[PDB]
Amino acid sequence: VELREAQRDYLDFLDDEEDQGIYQSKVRELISDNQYRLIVNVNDLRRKNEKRANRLLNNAFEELVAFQRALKDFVASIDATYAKQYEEFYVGLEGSFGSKHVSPRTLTSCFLSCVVCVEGIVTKCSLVRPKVVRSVHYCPATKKTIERRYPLETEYGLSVYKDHQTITIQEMPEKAPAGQLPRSVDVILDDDLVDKAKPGDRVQVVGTYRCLPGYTSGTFRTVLIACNVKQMSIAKIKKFSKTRSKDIFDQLAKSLAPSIHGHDYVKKAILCLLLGGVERDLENGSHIRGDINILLIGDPSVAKSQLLRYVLCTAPRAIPTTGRGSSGVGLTAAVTTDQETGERRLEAGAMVLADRGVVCIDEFDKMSDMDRTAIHEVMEQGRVTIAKAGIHARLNARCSVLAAANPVYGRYDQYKTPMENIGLQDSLLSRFDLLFIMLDQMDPEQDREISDHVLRMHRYRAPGEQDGDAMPLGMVSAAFMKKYIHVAKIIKPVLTQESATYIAEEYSRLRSQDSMSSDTARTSPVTARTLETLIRLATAHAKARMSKTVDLQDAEEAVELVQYAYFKK
Amino acid sequence: LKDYALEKEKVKKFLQEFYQDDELGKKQFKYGNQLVRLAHREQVALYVDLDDVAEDDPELVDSICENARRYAKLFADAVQELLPQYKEREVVNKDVLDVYIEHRLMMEQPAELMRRFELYFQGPSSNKPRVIREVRADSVGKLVTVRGIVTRVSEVKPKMVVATYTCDQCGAETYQPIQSPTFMPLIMCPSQECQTNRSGGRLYLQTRGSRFIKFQEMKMQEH
DNA sequence: TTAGAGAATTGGAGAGTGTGTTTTTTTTTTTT
DNA sequence: ACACACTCTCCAATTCTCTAA
Numbered sequence: 001v002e003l004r005e006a007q008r009d010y011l012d013f014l015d016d017e018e019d020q021g022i023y024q025s026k027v028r029e030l031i032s033d034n035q036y037r038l039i040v041n042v043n044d045l046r047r048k049n050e051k052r053a054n055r056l057l058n059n060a061f062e063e064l065v066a067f068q069r070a071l072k073d074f075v076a077s078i079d080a081t082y083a084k085q086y087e088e089f090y091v092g093l094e095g096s097f098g099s100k101h102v103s104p105r106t107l108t109s110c111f112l113s114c115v116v117c118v119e120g121i122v123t124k125c126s127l128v129r130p131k132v133v134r135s136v137h138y139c140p141a142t143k144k145t146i147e148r149r150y151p152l153e154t155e156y157g158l159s160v161y162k163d164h165q166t167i168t169i170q171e172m173p174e175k176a177p178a179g180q181l182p183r184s185v186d187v188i189l190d191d192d193l194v195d196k197a198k199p200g201d202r203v204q205v206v207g208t209y210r211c212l213p214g215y216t217s218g219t220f221r222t223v224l225i226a227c228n229v230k231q232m233s234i235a236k237i238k239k240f241s242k243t244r245s246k247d248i249f250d251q252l253a254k255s256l257a258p259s260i261h262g263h264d265y266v267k268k269a270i271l272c273l274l275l276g277g278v279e280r281d282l283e284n285g286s287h288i289r290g291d292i293n294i295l296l297i298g299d300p301s302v303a304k305s306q307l308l309r310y311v312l313c314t315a316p317r318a319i320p321t322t323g324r325g326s327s328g329v330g331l332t333a334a335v336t337t338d339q340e341t342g343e344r345r346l347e348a349g350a351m352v353l354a355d356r357g358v359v360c361i362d363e364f365d366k367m368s369d370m371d372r373t374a375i376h377e378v379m380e381q382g383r384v385t386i387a388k389a390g391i392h393a394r395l396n397a398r399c400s401v402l403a404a405a406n407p408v409y410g411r412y413d414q415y416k417t418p419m420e421n422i423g424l425q426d427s428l429l430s431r432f433d434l435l436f437i438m439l440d441q442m443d444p445e446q447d448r449e450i451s452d453h454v455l456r457m458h459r460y461r462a463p464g465e466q467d468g469d470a471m472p473l474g475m476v477s478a479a480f481m482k483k484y485i486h487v488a489k490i491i492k493p494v495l496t497q498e499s500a501t502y503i504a505e506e507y508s509r510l511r512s513q514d515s516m517s518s519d520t521a522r523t524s525p526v527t528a529r530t531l532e533t534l535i536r537l538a539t540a541h542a543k544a545r546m547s548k549t550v551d552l553q554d555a556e557e558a559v560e561l562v563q564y565a566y567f568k569k
Numbered sequence: 570l571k572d573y574a575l576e577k578e579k580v581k582k583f584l585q586e587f588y589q590d591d592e593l594g595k596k597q598f599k600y601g602n603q604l605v606r607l608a609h610r611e612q613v614a615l616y617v618d619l620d621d622v623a624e625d626d627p628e629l630v631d632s633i634c635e636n637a638r639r640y641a642k643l644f645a646d647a648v649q650e651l652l653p654q655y656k657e658r659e660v661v662n663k664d665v666l667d668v669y670i671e672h673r674l675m676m677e678q679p680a681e682l683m684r685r686f687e688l689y690f691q692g693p694s695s696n697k698p699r700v701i702r703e704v705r706a707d708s709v710g711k712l713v714t715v716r717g718i719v720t721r722v723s724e725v726k727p728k729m730v731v732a733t734y735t736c737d738q739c740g741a742e743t744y745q746p747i748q749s750p751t752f753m754p755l756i757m758c759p760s761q762e763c764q765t766n767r768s769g770g771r772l773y774l775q776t777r778g779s780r781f782i783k784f785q786e787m788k789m790q791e792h
Numbered sequence: 793t794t795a796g797a798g799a800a801t802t803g804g805a806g807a808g809t810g811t812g813t814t815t816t817t818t819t820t821t822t823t824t
Numbered sequence: 825a826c827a828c829a830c831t832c833t834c835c836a837a838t839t840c841t842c843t844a845a
């Protein structure tokens with residue numbers, strides 16, 4: 001009956017006030033926040049008692065129950081009244097697990113009853129619903145009662161229930177072996193862990209791998225009973241922004257996507273898309289769109305696809321899509337039959353999952369127009385209306401669209417106007433904020449530096465790799481860039497009278513010039529949407545400075561950008 | 570657990586003694602006036618307000634908020650016991666179902682069949698509304714307040730409350746109160762004369778005697 | 793002659809056991 | 825949890841036989 005000594009070990013481990021008192025402090029915090037689970041770091045346990053630590057990982061169940069009882073006794077010794085508020089306490093684990101860190105592919109039947117640490121990408125969820133643990137019945141005519149664990153009438157207030165949910169984890173597709181589809185596993189979430197993860201999240205789950213029963217065919221289904229769930233995704237920024245020696249926005253734009261050479265204005269516009277504008281609301285109930293949309297058109301081999309694959313790696317909550325490989329149902333939402341409950345419910349599509357994020361559409365000119373009808377409502381209003389599976393609803397799909405396409409006839413024709421080369425409808429072309437045209441002008445002076453840069457890139461080898469190796473199948477630093485952009489997304493700067501005056505006067509001047517100009521010399525007409533674009537771009541530039549005001553410099557930069565985009569051949 | 574008899578007397582005391590400084594401060598004892606109207610069949614439902622209870626006994630309010638179903642039954646029985654004291658008048662006969670009850674009284678000379686009133690709670694002003702996502706399993710059995718948009722509603726259907734049967738041979742009647750969403754009906758007479766003689770009389774259900782209530786189903790959705 | 797008590801055979805009243813149970817992607821012909 | 829089909833048992837109703845009113 002050594003488990004009574006094992007519980008005794010855990011209780012004297014938890015009583016660490018004699019040695020710097022970290023865990024007693026954590027338990028005190030748990031009490032103050034009215035909580036009922038604790039998170040223990042396995043490194044500390046391994047340091048204090050090697051035998052107990054190395055036994056815990058290979059006997060998850062029999063050891064964790066002893067640990068839970070030790071915690072219950074310790075909190076009761078601190079405060080019995082608090083200990084009586086909850087039926088039982090729980091403990092979760094963190095740290096380094098060594099050999100027990102696995103994936104949904106490498107996890108096999110020999111891991112049963114070990115503590116395991118699985119990681120992958122979440123693909124689906126069931127709905128939260130209650131489960132019974134103890135039921136009670138009472139008789140008022142006799143003052144009598146009975147109980148059961150898992151005449152008289154049921155006592156819902158003396159009975160007690162707890163929450164239950166199921167989710168599914170999938171292997172990272174980048175790590176799949178050659179020529180095979182990804183594998184997956186089912187995770188069970190219970191009590192205070194429900195709804196801590198949603199589809200598209202990258203998670204790392206700690207739990208115990210276990211069979212479920214099922215005459216018998218001698219065959220079982222295996223599930224991971226979760227024990228903890230984890231997610232993954234100042235002075236430096238202060239002194240850097242305080243310098244004011246140079247236009248910081250130009251330096252950040254120059255440093256964007258170092259592999260790709262040229263295309264200055266495109267990089268500046270993409271940085272404005274990453275920073276975004278700001279929303280505003282009016283007393284009549286109307287509101288102004290804060291997010292930005294961008295379109296790219298051009299010849300073969302001008303790095304259009306690579307810029308999309310870069311933004312997708314350097315922005316939070318970003319999604320890919322290709323014109324030929326996707327459907328309107330897949331873009332918005334699809335009805336699904338739940339196998340846990342049997343019920344019919346909706347499942348999110350690509351543009352819904354990109355809410356408060358970015359969505360990249362490659363090969364945009366190959367979509368059927370019926371899909372573009374779905375994209376129209378999303379890009380204009382940020383909402384999507386659905387009328388299926390007994391639900392009439394207005395879902396949230398607020399996102400910035402970055403899209404790329406190739407011109408009609410494959411190679412752009414100099415002897416035709418922009419509206420002739422571009423294959424899209426004039427209604428749709430009016431929705432994007434900025435439209436860029438890119439061309440492979442075969443100048444030898446430019447080919448010299450381009451070819452040199454490409455060849456420099458192909459001779460590199462990483463410092464952690466040796467002279468002849470080959471990989472298996474399966475300027476500002478990037479880290480600072482991410483942190484600076486992340487802080488800059490809070491500032492919410494405001495207009496100034498001078499910037500407003502400048503924008504108004506300059507817009508009137510631009511309108512007069514456009515009135516003089518002809519469709520043979522412009523991509524699209526200029527209207528109030530131009531003012532909205534100018535305001536968004538000036539706001540974003542002020543945001544990059546972290547200046548609380550929108551200044552004349554921001555407005556001047558914004559108008560120069562749109563001037564280049566609209567009034568160059 | 571509490572003695573629900575003591576709690577019944579406390580509830581009676583609240584109904585008998587509470588005045589809200591009511592009728593422009595004239596102290597006319599709102600619930601006493603309501604009991605007069607209920608006794609004279611002027612009114613059907615009675616909404617007891619928990620803010621009124623809080624003036625005298627906040628512990629009672631807390632007792633009600635958890636395991637509300639017990640206190641629903643308790644208040645209903647208290648009101649039924651107090652109703653004759655606020656009666657002074659004889660009411661005119663106006664309903665076929667009550668004509669059967671009148672015949673039953675005339676022939677005699679369960680309470681659920683006679684209990685022609687409804688009792689409901691109006692939530693305490695302390696309790697802010699939850700969203701449909703925050704009503705988790707720790708709230709089972711407890712009084713709650715929720716906010717949302719209606720999506721669908723059914724027509725009004727008759728819901729059975731107590732069934733009334735008649736016996737072909739012995740001329741007696743039998744009753745069966747209903748509580749669960751389903752039930753099973755009776756078949757053969759349980760009265761002592763039929764049973765002792767094993768005479769085999771059958772039971773016929775009477776829609777003219779049994780009691781029904783208006784029932785409707787609805788769905789509500791998040792903003 | 794008519795009727796009741798003690799012994800033998802048989803019907804059926806009753807219990808126990810075993811078992812069943814609209815909403816999305818892709819192809820093919822013929823209409824345009 | 826709630827209905828058919830089947831098997832089986834014990835209690836006491838119906839008749840034979842001997843006897844008294």
Ligand SMILES: Nc1ncnc2c1ncn2[C@@H]1O[C@H](COP(=O)(O)OP(=O)(O)NP(=O)(O)O)[C@@H](O)[C@H]1O
Pocket residue numbers: 259260261262298299300301302303304305306307406450454
């Ligand atoms: N300026 C450049 N810097 C770096 N690589 C470049 C540059 N221009 C072209 N490339 C190369 O161009 C190749 C193709 O890039 P890609 O993004 O597919 O071009 P694209 O404009 O999208 N052409 P396409 O997809 O056929 O319409 C890549 O392998 C790059 O290495």
Ligand SMILES: [Mg+2]
Pocket residue numbers: 303304305306
């Ligand atoms: Mg490409």
Ligand SMILES: [Zn+2]
Pocket residue numbers: 736737738739740741758759760763770
């Ligand atoms: Zn009867």
